[PDB]
Amino acid sequence: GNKLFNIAQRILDTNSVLLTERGDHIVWINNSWKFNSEEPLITKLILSIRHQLPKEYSSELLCPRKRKTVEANIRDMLVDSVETDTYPDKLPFKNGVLDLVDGMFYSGDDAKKYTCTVSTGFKFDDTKFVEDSPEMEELMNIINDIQPLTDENKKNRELYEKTLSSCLCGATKGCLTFFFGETATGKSTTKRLLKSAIGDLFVIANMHLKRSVKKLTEPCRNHATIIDGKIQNNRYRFAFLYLLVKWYKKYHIPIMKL
Amino acid sequence: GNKLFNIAQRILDTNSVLLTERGDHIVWINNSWKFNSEEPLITKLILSIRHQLPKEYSSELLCPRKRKTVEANIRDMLVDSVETDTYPDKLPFKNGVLDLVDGMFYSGDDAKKYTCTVSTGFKFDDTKFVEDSPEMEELMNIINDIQPLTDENKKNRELYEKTLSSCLCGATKGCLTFFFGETATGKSTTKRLLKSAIGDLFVEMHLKRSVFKKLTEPRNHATIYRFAFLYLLVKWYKKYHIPIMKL
Amino acid sequence: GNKLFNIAQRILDTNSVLLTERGDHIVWINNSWKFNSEEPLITKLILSIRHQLPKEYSSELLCPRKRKTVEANIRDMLVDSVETDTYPDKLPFKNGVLDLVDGMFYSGDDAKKYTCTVSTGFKFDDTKFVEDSPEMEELMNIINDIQPLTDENKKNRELYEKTLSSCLCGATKGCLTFFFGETATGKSTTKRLLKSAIGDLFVEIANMHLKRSVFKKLTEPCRNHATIIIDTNVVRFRTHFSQPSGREAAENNDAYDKVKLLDEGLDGKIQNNRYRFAFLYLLVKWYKKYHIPIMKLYP
Amino acid sequence: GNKLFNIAQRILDTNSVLLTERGDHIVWINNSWKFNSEEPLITKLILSIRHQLPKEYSSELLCPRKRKTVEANIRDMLVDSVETDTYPDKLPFKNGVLDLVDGMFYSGDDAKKYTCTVSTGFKFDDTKFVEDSPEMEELMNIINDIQPLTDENKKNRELYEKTLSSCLCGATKGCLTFFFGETATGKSTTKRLLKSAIGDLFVETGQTILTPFIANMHLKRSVFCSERSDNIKKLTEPCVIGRPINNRNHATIIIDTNYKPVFDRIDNALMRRIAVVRFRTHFSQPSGREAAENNDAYDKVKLLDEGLDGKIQNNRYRFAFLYLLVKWYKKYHIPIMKLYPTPE
Amino acid sequence: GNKLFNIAQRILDTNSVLLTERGDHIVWINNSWKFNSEEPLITKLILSIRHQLPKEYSSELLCPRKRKTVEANIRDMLVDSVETDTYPDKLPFKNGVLDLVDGMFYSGDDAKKYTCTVSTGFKFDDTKFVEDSPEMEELMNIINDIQPLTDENKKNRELYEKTLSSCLCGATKGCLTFFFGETATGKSTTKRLLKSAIGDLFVETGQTILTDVLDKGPNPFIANMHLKRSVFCSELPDFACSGSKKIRSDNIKKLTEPCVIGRPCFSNKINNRNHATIIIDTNYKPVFDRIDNALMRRIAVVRFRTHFSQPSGREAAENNDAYDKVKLLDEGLDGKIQNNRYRFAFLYLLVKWYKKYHIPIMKLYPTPEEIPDFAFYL
Amino acid sequence: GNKLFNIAQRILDTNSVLLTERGDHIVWINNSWKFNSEEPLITKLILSIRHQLPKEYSSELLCPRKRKTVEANIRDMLVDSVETDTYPDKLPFKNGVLDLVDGMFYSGDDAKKYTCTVSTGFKFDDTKFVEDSPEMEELMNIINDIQPLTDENKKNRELYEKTLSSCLCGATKGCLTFFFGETATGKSTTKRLLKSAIGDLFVETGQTILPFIANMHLKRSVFCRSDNIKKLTEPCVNRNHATIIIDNALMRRIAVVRFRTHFSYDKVKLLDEGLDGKIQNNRYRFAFLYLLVKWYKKYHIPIMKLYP
Ligand SMILES: Nc1ncnc2c1ncn2[C@@H]1O[C@H](COP(=O)(O)OP(=O)(O)O)[C@@H](O)[C@H]1O
Ligand SMILES: Nc1ncnc2c1ncn2[C@@H]1O[C@H](COP(=O)(O)OP(=O)(O)O)[C@@H](O)[C@H]1O
Ligand SMILES: Nc1ncnc2c1ncn2[C@@H]1O[C@H](COP(=O)(O)OP(=O)(O)O)[C@@H](O)[C@H]1O
Ligand SMILES: Nc1ncnc2c1ncn2[C@@H]1O[C@H](COP(=O)(O)OP(=O)(O)O)[C@@H](O)[C@H]1O
Ligand SMILES: Nc1ncnc2c1ncn2[C@@H]1O[C@H](COP(=O)(O)OP(=O)(O)O)[C@@H](O)[C@H]1O
Ligand SMILES: Nc1ncnc2c1ncn2[C@@H]1O[C@H](COP(=O)(O)OP(=O)(O)O)[C@@H](O)[C@H]1O
C-alpha cells in the first residue's frame, strides 16, 4: 500500500490510541492514558513511537506535515469506541496503575490494559509506600487527634474510615455521608490530606471521572464520593495513601456500598 | 472521467450514506446507523468500504486528502432527505435489528433496510436469548413476587403486561400508565429491570421508546436479564400487541 | 477564454440561484427553493446542472475543487437581491406550487417563477385532489356535526369556513380569530384536520416566520403571514361530542346543542392523513368563495 | 511591475472602493455604495469594474484567486479613511441620488461624489415622479381626508407637512414628534404611505426605546414607534449611545399614540424638544358609522375603504407621496432645517 | 541570506513598526502612529515604505503573499515592548504632532519620536492656526457670550479656561469637573466646540459609568475611554423622583486613577490608561450615595449663566433668577459648528490658554463651595 | 534525516522552551520567561536562538514557513508538563531575577533555572540598587512621615513592614489584610509606591470579589461575604501568591494596620502636590525596592507567616 498508511496501521496494531464515547481520542505516551479535546495529542504519539518502527518507517515521521497525514489516517480508523474505567478497584498514577486487591504497583504496558483516562497527576515513588518512616507515626497521631479511638467514637471512626477509603473506587456511589462539625475541628486538614493522597481525583462539568468532590447519586459519568504548613509541601502523601489502601482492603473487598 | 467520482458513485450505490431532515448525514459502519456533527464519519465509511471496491479503486482510498475529495463528492450528491425510524415493530440492537412479530433476529445487510437510528446500546448474543436458563427461573420468580396471579391481580396483570410490552414499538403511544402504590412494591425494581432489558431506548426523549395530552403527540416513541426479560417482553408482545398497538 | 467563468455565467443564465435581502443564497434543486445559511447549497446545484451543459463543460464539474471556483464566480456575480414570496395567492408543495385562485397545480420550471422558499413539507399527491372520494363525504359529515348548516349557525359556519380558508394566503392577516367553546366540541379536531391539510406551515416570534397558519403587535406585516388562532375554553362551538359513557352525558346542559357519538378511531385516522387531501380540496373550494377579489378578516 | 498591482492601482484610481471610520470597506456597484461585513464585497467590484480596464487587464480577473490578490493589494493601499454622508439634502435610491433643493435625479458618476452608504432599497423611476397622474389625485384626496386644509386646522397641517418632509435629510433632528390621535384615523395609513415612499430609510421599533433597538437605527431617516424622561434627552443628539458604542442620529422620531402622553419628569428642558399634531378625521365602518358622529373627540367622519391598505402595500402610492414630500421639503427646509417645538 | 529578511531588517531599522505593552502592533503610515486590532495594519506599512528601499528591494513588495512573509518576519523580530504616549504635552493630529510648550508644528521623523498612537482625527492646516481671522473674532464673541469677562464671573471664567485647557495634555487628571447649568445655556455648545477642536480624543458615554458596579460583565463604555483626553457623560436626570439611582460615590475615585479597570465585549484586557479629563454635563445638583472628605477632593464645578432663547421665550426667560444674562439664540450656529468652522480658532485659543496656565506643571483644583450638602459638610 | 528536526532538538536541548501544566508554552527570550496564549511565541525564540546554531543551521531560520516547521516539531517534542514558580523567594525583573535570600541579582542562564513567568514589568538598573543615593533619604523621610518610628506605633510599624515586605514571594499567605484609614492618609500613596516597586506583580480589582480572578494568577500582591474571605486565603482559588491588602476562623484570617498621621489623628502634616508626579514616574522605584529587600532579609529569612 502506502508508507504513511502502513505506519498508521502498525501504530494502531499496538493499541496505543483509542476512541471513547465522549468523542475523545485517548493517547498512550509517557506511561499514562492522556487526552485533550482541544488539539491533537496523537501527533505526539506518532513522534514517540518513532523508536518502535523499522528504519524505513522511522525517518518518514520527522516532518510535521507527515505527522498530520498519519494522524488523520489513525483518526479515520477508530470506527468503534472502547469502554473506559471498566475496573473500579484501580488507582491511576502518572507512571502506572495500582491494584487495591493486593497493593502492588504496575508500570508500562502492564498499566495499559487497564484503561484509566484520568490519573492522580503525580508519579508513584517506590521508596515511599513503606510501612514505617518518619512520617507514619505523626500521621497516625494526628488522625487519632482529629478522630479519637474510643468506644463511643468507635462506630464514628469505622464510618469515617469507610468513607475515606471509598475515595478510590471507579464506580459510582449512591449514598451520602455528612461532614457536620463545629468551627475548627480539622475538616480542612482532612480535605488537604485526602487531596495530597489522590490529587487530580478531587475537586458539574469539571467533576468528570473524579472520585471525590438525589441528583448526585445517579450513574451519569461520575464516580465521586459526595461528602497545616507541612501538608502543602506534600509530606503525608504516601503514608495517608497507605492508610487509605489499608482501610479499603479492610472494608471494601466484596461489594462497594455506603 | 474521474476516478474519485466513480468511487463516490459506487459508494452511494450501496445506500450506506443517507441524509436526515436535520441536514445531517447518517452512515452505516459495523452494523449501526451512526451519525455525528463534530467529526463526520463519511470519511470513516470511505476508509471502511475499500474492501468492497475493485483493486484499482481500493488503492486510491488509502489517503487522507484523497478521502476528503470522495467525501465532498458524496456529500454534494445527497440532494434530498430521507426519513428515519419508520418501522415501529423492530428492536435495534448494536449488531442488527430483531423483529417482534416474527421473532427472527436479523444482522448485517438484512438489518440495513430498517433505518433505526437509535440503538438498544448493547450487542445481542444469540446464545443467551433462550427459554431455559438459570436466570430466567429466578426472574419469573421475582416477577411473581412483585405481582402475583391472584384475584385482585388478574386484570391488573393484563394491564401490566400490556404496558410493559408497549415499550418496544416505534409508534406513538395513545395512553399514559401510572404506578400508584406503596414503597417496596416493585416500582423501582421493574424500572431497573426494564432499563436492563431495553437498554439505551430508555430515559428516566428523541426516539426514546420509554420514559419514566402533550406527551401523546407525534419526534417521540416513549410510553410515559437482557435475554430473559427480553424473552418475556417479546412473548407478551406476541400475546397482546399482535394486530394493532393501542393503550 | 475561462471555462470556469463561462460555466458560472451559464448557470446564472438559468436563473437557478438567487440572492436574498437576508443574505442567503436560495437554490433551485428538486423543484424546491431550498436555502441553508450554514453550508452553501450552490455546489450541489453546480453538480446537478451538470447534465445540461456541453460535454466539454460537464467533465470539469466532477472535481470538488473546480466547483468552489464556480461557486466563487457565481457569488461574485450576484449583486441584485431578489425578493422572496411576493405572490400571496399560492400554496407551495414539495413538487411545485398550487394556484388557489384558478385551481391547477404547477410543477417543475413552472413553479420556479413563484419564489416560494417555505413549503408544506409533504408531497402533493395528484390523484388525491378529487371532489369525490371515500373520505371527503365522511370529512364533510365531520364539519356538519361540528358546524351544522342551521339558520342560527349559518353565520358561525361562514366565519369558520372563512377562517379555515384564510390559512392559505401569503399575505399578512389583520384579525385574531377565536375558537371559543366548551370541552369536546371539535376544535382540536379542526386543528388536526388543518395540520394534516397544510402541514409544515403550521406552528403550535422568530420561529413563527413565513408560516401561513399558527395556533395589535401580531397584526402587522413586520415577515408575518400567519393566521393567528387562539383556542379558549370569534367562531363559537356548540355541538359537544360525547362518548358512550357520555351518552348519558347528552341531555341536560345548554352549553351544547347537539351531541354526536364519539368516534375514538377518528383521531387515529387523522395522523394517518386519511382526510388530508379531502381537506385540501375543501379549503381551496372554500377559499375561492370569500377571498377571490381580496383577502381580509373582519374583527 | 506586478500586473495585479497595476490592476489594483487602476481600480483605486477610479475611486470605486472607499474606506470609512468604522472598519467597513464600502464598494460602489450598481450605482450604489454598498457595504457588508460578512463578505469582501470588494471582490465583487473587481469583477464588475472589469469592463473598464484594457483588454490585457481583463481576462485575468476571471479567476477567483486573482481577485483575492487584487483585493489584498487594494486593502493594503487604502491607508486613509473618508468621511461619509456629509450631504444631508440628498435622498439615495438604489439607482441614483435625488437632490432635494432642486429635485433632480442624478445617476452614474454624478451620483457618486455624494457618498450614500444607506439607500431607500428600490429604484427611482423617472416617468412616475410627476404631478399629473390618477394616483396623484387619489393620494391628494387621501391626504385631504386625513388632514384637511381648513382654518382651524392650519398650524397643525403645517406641522404635519414639516414633520413628514423632514424625513428626507441626513441632518440630526433635535425634536420629538407625536401623531397623537384616536384609533383608526390614519396614523398607520401615514406610516404605510411613508414606508412605501422612502423605503429602507424607515424603521419601526418597540416601546423599550421610550421606556439593541438603538443600534439598528443607524443612518435611518425615519423611526416610527407605534402603540422615561431622559430617553428624549438622549434621542435628539447627533451621537446617540448604543451598542449592538456611538451611532449617528440622522433620524426623525415619530411616535404613534392614542391617548395624551404622560412623562416621568416634566421640566422646561423637555418642552423644547416636543411636538404634537392632532388627528381629527375618523374613518369608521358603515355599520358603525352612526356611532362616530355623536362622539366629540373627533371632528369629521368618512367611509373606511378596504382595498386602500392592499394597494398601499403594493407600493402603488409610492412616487406620488415622494413628490409630495419633495414639494413640502422645498418649502420649509431650503435655507436651513430646524424642527420647532410646540409646548402647547 | 534572504532577500525578504533583509527587507524586514531594513524596515525595522527605520523604527516604523513598534510593539506596545497592550500587545498591539502600531505602524507609521502617513505621519500617524495608527493601530488596528482586527487586521495586521503592518502589511500596509510594508507597501508604503516601498519607496524608502533600493530598486531591488521595492519590486518584491508588489506581491501580497510576499508581504505576508515580511509581516511575519517583522512580527518575529519585535521581541521588546514599548510604552507609548509617554510625552503628555503633545497634541497628535492626522498629519503631525503639535507641541504645546511653544506651539511649533512637526512632521515626519520630527513627530515620530513621540509615539502617540491616538490622534485628533483631522489634518492640521498651517494658515488657520493664527490670531487674526473673522472666525477667530466671532469665536471670541461667542465664547465671551458663554462666559462673560466680568469680575463676578472672573473666577468661574478662569477655572473654565483651565478645565478646557487641560483637555490637551496626556497626563492623568485626578479632579472630576462638572458642567452644572440650566437648560439652553451652552454646555452642549462647549461640548460640540471641544468635539470639533480635539475630535477623536473625545468620547460620549451614558450615566451607567456613574451609577453601576463597573466591573460585572462586559462593559465597553470603559474600554473605549482609553487614552482619550476628554470624556463627556451627558444625560444626568434629576434624582428627586422614584427609580433614580444615586451617583455611586466610589466611581469618582475609580475614574481618577492613572489606570481604569473594565472589560470590553469578550476580552481580557481589563487595564486602560486613563488620560481623560472626566467632565460631567449635568443640569441639577448631583447627589451621591455618601458624602465625605475623600470624595470632596475630586470634584470641581463651573456654573453656566448666560441663557439662550428666541424672542418668543425671551420675556419668560428674562425674569428667571436661575440665569444672569440672556442673548439672542442663533439657529445656524449649530450648523456652522458641526461643519468644523470654529475648529482651528478654538484650538489656537486652547493652546494659548494652556501656555498661559499649565506651562510649569499640570494640576487641577476642586471647588466644593457650590453644592448644598457639600456646603453643609463644610 | 531532517535539518529542521535537528534544529528543534538543539533548541530544546538548551531548555529555552518549556511546557507548563496549564497547557501553555513558556519561552526564554531576552532573559525573561514570556508566555502568551494568543499566538505561538516559540517562533520568536527560533529567531532569537539563530545566533547559537551552526552556520548551516542558521540560514534555515530566515524563513517564516521554516520557522513554523521547527515550531511544529518543538510543539510535538514537549510531552512532559513542568511546574512553574516553584521558588517563592525570588523577584523576577524583565532582565533577570533577584535572589531575596542574600540580595544579589542574577541574569541570563543564571536566572533561567528559576522558572518564574510573571516579571515585575521593568528592568533592573545595576547602578541604582544602592543604600545611599540622592533619591533615597527622602524615601525613608516620606515613609517615616506616613508611619513615624514611634514606640507607641512600633508594633504598627513592624506589622506594616512585615506585610509590605511579604509582597515579594511566591508562597501562599493565609490571612487577609486591610489598609483601613481616613482620607488623605497615604494609603493610595503606599499603593502607588508598591506598584512602582513591583509593577506587574500588582493588580487592582473592585469589590465584586469581596474573570476578575483569572488575571490575579501568580501575582504577589493585589488590592481592592465572609465566604469569599474563607476562599481567598487558600493555595488555590489558578495559583494564589497574592498578599491580599485592601467567628474564630474569621478571627485567624484578618490583619489590619491602622494609619494614624493625617496630611493636608495624632499628627497633621503638609501635602506634597508634586509627590504623586514624582511617584508615578518611578523615581523611588529602586530605592523602595532596596528598602523592601532589606526588610525581607531582616524579617522573613527563616520562614514566612503573617500572624493576625
Ligand atoms: N493533631 C493536630 N495537630 C496540630 N494541629 C491540629 C491538629 N488537629 C487540628 N489541628 C488544627 O486545627 C485546625 C482545623 O481548622 P479548620 O478545620 O481548617 O477550620 P475551618 O475549616 O473552619 O477553617 C487546623 O488549622 C490545624 O492546624
Ligand atoms: N421479587 C422482589 N420482590 C420484592 N422486592 C424485591 C424483589 N427483588 C428485589 N427486591 C428488592 O426490594 C426492593 C423493592 O423496592 P421497590 O418496590 O422498587 O420500591 P423502592 O425501590 O422505592 O423501595 C428493591 O430495592 C429490591 O432490591
Ligand atoms: N363527527 C365526528 N367525527 C369523528 N370524531 C368526532 C366527531 N365529533 C367528535 N369527535 C371526537 O370528539 C373529540 C372532541 O374533542 P375536542 O372538541 O377536540 O376537545 P377540545 O375542544 O377540548 O380540544 C375529538 O377527539 C373527536 O375525535
Ligand atoms: N382617505 C381615506 N378614504 C377612505 N379610507 C381610508 C382613508 N384613509 C384611511 N382609510 C382606511 O381607514 C383605515 C384607517 O386605519 P388607521 O387610521 O391606520 O388605524 P390606526 O390609526 O388605529 O392604526 C385604513 O385601513 C384605510 O384603509
Ligand atoms: N452665543 C451663543 N453661544 C452658544 N450657543 C448659543 C448662542 N446663542 C444661542 N445659542 C444656542 O444654544 C444652543 C445650545 O444649548 P443647549 O444645547 O440647549 O445646552 P444644554 O443642552 O446644555 O441645555 C444651540 O442650539 C445654539 O443655537
Ligand atoms: N507624608 C506626606 N507628605 C506629603 N504629602 C503626603 C504625605 N502623605 C500623603 N500625602 C499626600 O496625600 C495624597 C494621598 O492621599 P491618599 O492617602 O491617597 O487619600 P485617599 O486614600 O483618601 O485617596 C498624595 O497626593 C500626597 O501628596
Tab-separated table of N, CA and C in Angstrom, chain D residues 75-147:
chain	number	residue	atom	x	y	z
D	75	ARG	N	-6.767	46.548	-0.303
D	75	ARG	CA	-6.871	46.716	1.140
D	75	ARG	C	-5.558	47.172	1.754
D	76	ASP	N	-4.443	46.963	1.060
D	76	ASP	CA	-3.136	47.427	1.502
D	76	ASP	C	-2.802	48.821	0.989
D	77	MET	N	-3.649	49.399	0.138
D	77	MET	CA	-3.413	50.721	-0.415
D	77	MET	C	-4.381	51.776	0.099
D	78	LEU	N	-5.415	51.386	0.842
D	78	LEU	CA	-6.376	52.344	1.383
D	78	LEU	C	-5.960	52.727	2.803
D	79	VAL	N	-4.928	53.572	2.865
D	79	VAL	CA	-4.348	53.976	4.142
D	79	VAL	C	-5.142	55.075	4.837
D	80	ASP	N	-5.994	55.798	4.113
D	80	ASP	CA	-6.705	56.947	4.654
D	80	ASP	C	-8.207	56.716	4.610
D	81	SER	N	-8.876	57.040	5.714
D	81	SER	CA	-10.323	56.941	5.802
D	81	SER	C	-10.983	58.179	5.200
D	82	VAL	N	-12.265	58.037	4.865
D	82	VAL	CA	-13.045	59.107	4.254
D	82	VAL	C	-14.350	59.267	5.024
D	83	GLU	N	-14.707	60.510	5.329
D	83	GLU	CA	-15.987	60.786	5.962
D	83	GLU	C	-17.123	60.558	4.969
D	84	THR	N	-18.244	60.046	5.475
D	84	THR	CA	-19.369	59.662	4.634
D	84	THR	C	-20.647	60.345	5.099
D	85	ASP	N	-21.542	60.585	4.138
D	85	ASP	CA	-22.854	61.184	4.388
D	85	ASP	C	-22.730	62.552	5.057
D	86	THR	N	-21.876	63.397	4.485
D	86	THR	CA	-21.782	64.787	4.907
D	86	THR	C	-22.791	65.681	4.200
D	87	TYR	N	-23.520	65.150	3.222
D	87	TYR	CA	-24.522	65.915	2.488
D	87	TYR	C	-25.908	65.491	2.946
D	88	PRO	N	-26.622	66.314	3.710
D	88	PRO	CA	-27.930	65.890	4.223
D	88	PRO	C	-29.042	65.974	3.190
D	89	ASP	N	-29.009	67.000	2.341
D	89	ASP	CA	-30.105	67.242	1.411
D	89	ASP	C	-29.993	66.375	0.164
D	90	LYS	N	-29.846	65.065	0.351
D	90	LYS	CA	-29.809	64.111	-0.748
D	90	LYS	C	-30.544	62.849	-0.324
D	91	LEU	N	-31.360	62.305	-1.226
D	91	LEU	CA	-32.090	61.076	-0.947
D	91	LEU	C	-31.560	59.958	-1.830
D	92	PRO	N	-30.975	58.909	-1.265
D	92	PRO	CA	-30.377	57.860	-2.099
D	92	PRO	C	-31.354	56.759	-2.477
D	93	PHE	N	-31.532	56.523	-3.773
D	93	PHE	CA	-32.279	55.383	-4.273
D	93	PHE	C	-31.307	54.365	-4.855
D	94	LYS	N	-31.778	53.124	-4.975
D	94	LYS	CA	-30.915	52.011	-5.353
D	94	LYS	C	-30.351	52.174	-6.762
D	95	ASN	N	-30.702	53.267	-7.446
D	95	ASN	CA	-30.138	53.519	-8.765
D	95	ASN	C	-29.739	54.979	-8.962
D	96	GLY	N	-29.585	55.750	-7.890
D	96	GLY	CA	-29.142	57.121	-8.040
D	96	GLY	C	-29.314	57.905	-6.755
D	97	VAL	N	-29.180	59.222	-6.885
D	97	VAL	CA	-29.343	60.149	-5.770
D	97	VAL	C	-30.225	61.301	-6.224
D	98	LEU	N	-31.275	61.587	-5.460
D	98	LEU	CA	-32.177	62.691	-5.756
D	98	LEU	C	-31.763	63.900	-4.926
D	99	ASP	N	-31.456	65.000	-5.606
D	99	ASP	CA	-31.123	66.259	-4.956
D	99	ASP	C	-32.416	67.020	-4.694
D	100	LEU	N	-32.701	67.261	-3.412
D	100	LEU	CA	-33.983	67.816	-2.994
D	100	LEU	C	-34.094	69.306	-3.292
D	101	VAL	N	-33.015	70.066	-3.074
D	101	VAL	CA	-33.071	71.517	-3.226
D	101	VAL	C	-33.433	71.921	-4.647
D	102	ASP	N	-33.179	71.051	-5.625
D	102	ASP	CA	-33.669	71.240	-6.979
D	102	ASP	C	-34.447	70.037	-7.492
D	103	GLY	N	-34.539	68.964	-6.711
D	103	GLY	CA	-35.332	67.806	-7.092
D	103	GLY	C	-34.876	67.133	-8.367
D	104	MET	N	-33.568	66.967	-8.539
D	104	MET	CA	-33.014	66.395	-9.759
D	104	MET	C	-32.406	65.036	-9.445
D	105	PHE	N	-32.702	64.049	-10.286
D	105	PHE	CA	-32.246	62.682	-10.064
D	105	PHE	C	-30.943	62.460	-10.823
D	106	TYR	N	-29.840	62.348	-10.087
D	106	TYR	CA	-28.530	62.070	-10.650
D	106	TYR	C	-28.271	60.570	-10.624
D	107	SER	N	-27.585	60.078	-11.653
D	107	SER	CA	-27.234	58.671	-11.754
D	107	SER	C	-25.843	58.540	-12.355
D	108	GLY	N	-25.186	57.422	-12.052
D	108	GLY	CA	-23.860	57.165	-12.574
D	108	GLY	C	-22.763	57.872	-11.805
D	109	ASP	N	-21.784	58.422	-12.528
D	109	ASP	CA	-20.694	59.139	-11.876
D	109	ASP	C	-21.199	60.365	-11.128
D	110	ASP	N	-22.264	60.997	-11.629
D	110	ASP	CA	-22.794	62.190	-10.976
D	110	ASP	C	-23.291	61.877	-9.571
D	111	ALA	N	-23.966	60.746	-9.398
D	111	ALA	CA	-24.441	60.338	-8.078
D	111	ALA	C	-23.429	59.446	-7.369
D	112	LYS	N	-22.178	59.880	-7.340
D	112	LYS	CA	-21.129	59.167	-6.619
D	112	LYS	C	-20.372	60.066	-5.656
D	113	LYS	N	-20.140	61.329	-6.019
D	113	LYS	CA	-19.444	62.240	-5.121
D	113	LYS	C	-20.240	62.511	-3.852
D	114	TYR	N	-21.548	62.260	-3.869
D	114	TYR	CA	-22.360	62.282	-2.653
D	114	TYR	C	-22.387	60.862	-2.111
D	115	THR	N	-21.459	60.563	-1.206
D	115	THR	CA	-21.387	59.229	-0.627
D	115	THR	C	-22.641	58.949	0.189
D	116	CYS	N	-23.337	57.868	-0.157
D	116	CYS	CA	-24.597	57.493	0.480
D	116	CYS	C	-24.555	55.998	0.774
D	117	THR	N	-24.135	55.642	1.987
D	117	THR	CA	-23.964	54.241	2.347
D	117	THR	C	-25.276	53.539	2.670
D	118	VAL	N	-26.384	54.271	2.772
D	118	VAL	CA	-27.696	53.685	3.019
D	118	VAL	C	-28.666	54.230	1.979
D	119	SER	N	-29.409	53.337	1.335
D	119	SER	CA	-30.315	53.694	0.255
D	119	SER	C	-31.742	53.312	0.622
D	120	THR	N	-32.690	53.825	-0.166
D	120	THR	CA	-34.101	53.532	0.063
D	120	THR	C	-34.445	52.074	-0.209
D	121	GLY	N	-33.589	51.350	-0.924
D	121	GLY	CA	-33.817	49.947	-1.192
D	121	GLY	C	-34.556	49.634	-2.472
D	122	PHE	N	-34.856	50.633	-3.298
D	122	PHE	CA	-35.544	50.391	-4.557
D	122	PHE	C	-35.129	51.447	-5.568
D	123	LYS	N	-35.392	51.154	-6.837
D	123	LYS	CA	-35.035	52.059	-7.915
D	123	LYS	C	-36.037	53.207	-8.006
D	124	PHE	N	-35.611	54.282	-8.663
D	124	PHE	CA	-36.400	55.505	-8.797
D	124	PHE	C	-36.757	55.682	-10.270
D	125	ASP	N	-38.000	55.358	-10.623
D	125	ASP	CA	-38.452	55.523	-11.997
D	125	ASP	C	-38.616	57.002	-12.323
D	126	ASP	N	-38.118	57.408	-13.492
D	126	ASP	CA	-38.230	58.807	-13.888
D	126	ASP	C	-39.648	59.153	-14.326
D	127	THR	N	-40.288	58.279	-15.100
D	127	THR	CA	-41.621	58.580	-15.626
D	127	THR	C	-42.726	58.071	-14.703
D	128	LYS	N	-42.558	58.325	-13.408
D	128	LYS	CA	-43.650	58.279	-12.441
D	128	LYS	C	-43.620	59.434	-11.456
D	129	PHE	N	-42.475	60.089	-11.266
D	129	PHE	CA	-42.342	61.251	-10.399
D	129	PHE	C	-42.944	62.468	-11.085
D	130	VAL	N	-44.266	62.472	-11.256
D	130	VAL	CA	-44.957	63.519	-11.994
D	130	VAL	C	-46.135	64.019	-11.171
D	131	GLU	N	-46.576	65.234	-11.495
D	131	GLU	CA	-47.672	65.872	-10.782
D	131	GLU	C	-49.036	65.568	-11.391
D	132	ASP	N	-49.078	64.989	-12.586
D	132	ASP	CA	-50.331	64.677	-13.270
D	132	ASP	C	-50.423	63.164	-13.447
D	133	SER	N	-51.267	62.528	-12.634
D	133	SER	CA	-51.498	61.088	-12.680
D	133	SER	C	-52.711	60.749	-11.820
D	134	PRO	N	-53.459	59.687	-12.140
D	134	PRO	CA	-54.609	59.339	-11.284
D	134	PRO	C	-54.209	59.009	-9.857
D	135	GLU	N	-53.065	58.344	-9.673
D	135	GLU	CA	-52.583	58.074	-8.325
D	135	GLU	C	-52.291	59.366	-7.578
D	136	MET	N	-51.887	60.416	-8.297
D	136	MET	CA	-51.644	61.705	-7.662
D	136	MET	C	-52.928	62.244	-7.046
D	137	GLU	N	-54.017	62.237	-7.820
D	137	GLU	CA	-55.296	62.719	-7.307
D	137	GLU	C	-55.806	61.841	-6.173
D	138	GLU	N	-55.638	60.521	-6.289
D	138	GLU	CA	-56.065	59.633	-5.210
D	138	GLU	C	-55.315	59.942	-3.917
D	139	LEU	N	-53.991	60.097	-4.005
D	139	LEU	CA	-53.200	60.396	-2.817
D	139	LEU	C	-53.559	61.759	-2.243
D	140	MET	N	-53.793	62.747	-3.109
D	140	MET	CA	-54.183	64.065	-2.624
D	140	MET	C	-55.516	64.002	-1.892
D	141	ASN	N	-56.470	63.236	-2.426
D	141	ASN	CA	-57.748	63.060	-1.744
D	141	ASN	C	-57.560	62.390	-0.389
D	142	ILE	N	-56.704	61.366	-0.325
D	142	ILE	CA	-56.449	60.695	0.948
D	142	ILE	C	-55.845	61.664	1.956
D	143	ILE	N	-54.871	62.465	1.524
D	143	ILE	CA	-54.214	63.397	2.438
D	143	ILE	C	-55.200	64.452	2.925
D	144	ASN	N	-56.037	64.971	2.023
D	144	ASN	CA	-57.044	65.947	2.430
D	144	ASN	C	-58.036	65.337	3.412
D	145	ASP	N	-58.425	64.080	3.190
D	145	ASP	CA	-59.300	63.399	4.136
D	145	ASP	C	-58.609	63.121	5.463
D	146	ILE	N	-57.282	63.023	5.473
D	146	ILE	CA	-56.545	62.791	6.710
D	146	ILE	C	-56.294	64.094	7.456
D	147	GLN	N	-55.852	65.132	6.748
D	147	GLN	CA	-55.583	66.436	7.351
D	147	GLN	C	-56.148	67.516	6.440
